[PDB]
Amino acid sequence: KLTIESMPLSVAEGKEVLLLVHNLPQHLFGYSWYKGERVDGNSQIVGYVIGTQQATPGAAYSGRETIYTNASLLIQNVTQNDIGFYTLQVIKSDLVNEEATGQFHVY
Amino acid sequence: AKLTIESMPLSVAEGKEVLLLVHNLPQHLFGYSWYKGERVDGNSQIVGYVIGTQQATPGAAYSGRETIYTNASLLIQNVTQNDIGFYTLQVIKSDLVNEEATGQFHVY
Ligand SMILES: [Cl-]
Which cellular compartments is it found in (chain B)? Predict the structure, then answer.
């Protein structure tokens, strides 16, 4: 069951947070990370194809975000206004796909 | 400032992956070099990475497990049970008065 863990859960403003991914399913084509709680193209940070290892930024990419090979997302220079919701869509090879949302708390 | 390395996570299940994050990079950098172990030593170099060109070149200690990112972070996959966990970053400044820092993780 796919879930997202924040390291750390509470993030000092301007510091960085790692979003770790637990329980990735098998037979994956790639990952997509979104700012906020929903899978929405206008809030996409990155699309990442595993086989090619090609990250392509989406309209929400700000320069702060880095995706890793294990699907983890590092966000640097976290802003005070950030509600902290980030959403991962796992794209399976059969396209019956899964999502999970995590959040951190800025102070 | 003071350059330091943080393991995400600090304790790593054997065969899983660990991210070495870098804190307090100085300014006016030419690149990064990552080493296996506690010392800057060519025989234990994983990668040399030039920032401007984004060119990573592997060193003799590159095993296939290690990937350097543009922010200096190093991701190590398939961590072995025997791994003592020490990894060392050398930051190469443009004036060559350089800095090092060592981090470690603990395999279980
Ligand atoms: Cl150059």
Answer: Membrane
Residue A13, φ and ψ in degrees, nearest 5: -60, 135
CA separation, residue B32 to residues A24, A25, B15, B28 (Å): 31, 34, 26, 12
Experimental determination approach used:
X-ray
CA distance A41 to A46: 10
CA A73 to chain centre: 5
Longest dimension (CA), chain A: 41
How far apart CA A44 and CA B85 sit, in angstroms, is 35
Resolution (A): 2.4
Residues A66, A45: Cα–Cα separation, whole Å: 9
Does the distance separating the beta carbons of A69 and B67 come in below 8 Å?
yes
Residue among B8, B17, B67 whose CB faces A7 most closely: B8
Contact A18 B19 (CB under 8 A): yes
What kind of architecture, by CATH, is found in domain A1-107? Sandwich (2.60)
First to last CA, chain B: 32
Strand A17-22, strand B106-107: pairing: unpaired
- CB spacing of B19 vs A66 below 8 angstroms: no
CATH number of the domain located at residue range(s) B1-108 in this protein: 2.60.40.10
